[model samples]
Target: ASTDYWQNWTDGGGIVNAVNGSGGNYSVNWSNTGNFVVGKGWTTGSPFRTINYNAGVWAPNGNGYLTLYGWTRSPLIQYYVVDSWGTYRPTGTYKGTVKSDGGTYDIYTTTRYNAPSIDGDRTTATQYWSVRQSKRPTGSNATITFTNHVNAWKSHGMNLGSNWAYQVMATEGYQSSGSSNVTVW
Candidate 1:
């Protein structure tokens, strides 16, 4: 099957744009201020163990992140496995930590009360996050072990819904500027 390229942005302010690269690859950039997300992966997200990716991300200018992003149904869940970021860090209810891919990740859960989700807008959802303790430098590529995170979340009682959605190596910016080169298979 062909790689799926996706891009979404909110016109809060400023300029935001993205373009697809070769195969499961993409690049994104934004200026001024806006909420933007773009990536390449599967149209129908497969199991977490099937993910293999590498990425080069520019400095998020203090307001963005480079992560593996996806969603699930049944109970409706949004998840992020963040490898790198800018100044702003994602914070929520701390849920201990897990080791994966030779790195330790801090687990967090943030609730989105009546927010946009794969289920649609104005819907409540739970966001699961695995943020790396030691941030990777911009332009560095690392192999992310997705299976470990999945198991860890499961063991922590943070179960994902049965129905899977798009799973992409995505770069997100919230009123910030940055660029990323990502490839996944």
Candidate 2:
């Protein structure tokens, strides 16, 4: 059996707390509420929407490897509020691999890697795109603050939907973390 895992703002569970108007923390229950998609496709919608470009384009050639390209976005917040939050953008290309596990479906293995540039081509005020997990600070309870001049809040959100595409993979069991409150902010 193959599995996928991620730690970021959009991986589901817990309300995102905008700490002291500076930064936020990911309080994840690590539930399996969402599935990761990969491929070459596009999408258009407001918040919680994504566009994948390579859903069914890969044909395994006995090499056990495949490549995909696309983009994604999370739900969009109001533009005015985003302006006050600060300006943040993803910079670089995120690299991951999809492999066949001798099963009917291939399995995707991903790591904390860089993503490509944020294309400033979106046409709607309610729609924005970003690379997932490109800027999260390291360490437990750590935070990355956007300077006053930057669009921080806008930068802190995650991108969901079809823009994110990966090779189809084998279904794996979902994992969960027990609930507990360790400290007060």
Candidate 3:
């Protein structure tokens, strides 16, 4: 198990969260129907480590989407959001393109977390990317991958010298319901 880990809660019965990890292998038990931050690694820090590079996959419950939530030090100690939860969502501050693996991702930038909704744990910047349409899983989990999102962050001029301030994966739910389990390796 890793020494640094986290499991945050908002005191909502609909949400039950837990994460147990060994080396790079991890399994999570969580519910976000209410609100919380559940995951491991760099969960807490002074300046929040800059997440320059990381690779992982998330499988979310039906109606629940996984995402990259973190804190950054561009100008202020602000939160960072990269919604890879597979929810085809609305557009925000900027319309951008993600060119990796020869694919184009047209996404929205929510400058502040939860502005569009109360799902995100805090008020920060978030980029929402949708998976294929109508493929949201329920009961079962879907594989959600995230590459280095520095380019996406660069698009917003939030240059955090390698963008690593407090990065973690989470299932963000907004008025969501149901309890589910997820495994990370």
Candidate 4:
């Protein structure tokens, strides 16, 4: 989900003077002009800003916790907040630890593929292990531990599975500023 705005203004023109009538207060009227001068503009573009919350970094406000309201053929079409915001970075390599109520899972520096563009195919450069959970969590918190050698990539056309249910929890650590560690609850 995203937010945007737009605006428009009109140029002053096309008003005529009273040729045969007495002088009266005549406001600028451009409404009758066949050619309406309309100007439109928008806010300046900025870097993509994400709010992490359930994830480790807490930069993107709403990370993890997805709600599957409907179904789709491709995992890409399945709408879930967790799936949408689970991992911000998808084109790079990262190492992290995933722990859950069932058992502990490890991502040994796995590399995930970039999300496929409309003209390209989806690919997976890394391997993500599946976790077992009976059902989605309800206001429960799961923790993910990350080391110093982890990174995430952001792009289109990465993972393509759409039928599996996952409540995977993991933490990714970064070395620089703006880089975040994510924990999906």
TM-score, each model? 0.89, 0.19, 0.55, 0.20
lDDT of 1: 0.75
- Give a tens-digit lDDT track for model 2, residues 1-185: 11122112222332222111111111212233232111111222122222111112122111111211222334322111010001232223322211111111111222222222123222233322122322222123321111210233223432234334221111111122221111111
lDDT of each: 0.75, 0.21, 0.43, 0.24
Per-residue C-alpha lDDT of model 4 across residues 1-185, encoded as one tens digit per residue: 22121111122223321111111111111222221111111122111222112322322222222211111234433111122223233222323434433334332324445632211235443333222222223333432221110121112222334343221121211121121232221
Q: Which stretches of candidate 2 lie over 4 Å from their true place?
A: 1-27, 34-125, 129-137, 147-185
Least well predicted 10-residue stretch by lDDT in candidate 1: 114-123
Q: Please give the lDDT score at residue 117 for candidate 4.
A: 22
Descending-lDDT candidate ranking: 1, 3, 4, 2
Off by over 4 Å in 4: 1-124, 147-185
Ranked candidates (TM-score, high to low): 1, 3, 4, 2
User: Which stretches of model 1 miss by more than 4 angstroms?
Assistant: 119-122, 138-141
Task: Select the stronger candidate by TM-score from 2 and 4.
Answer: 4
- Superposed on all Cα atoms, model 3 deviates from the true structure by an RMSD in Å of 6.4
lDDT of 1 by residue, 1-185 (tens): 55664646454567766777788877777787665667777767655545566775565786888888888888788889988888787878998898987788999999988656663345677999999987765444466677788888888889988998888878887767766677776
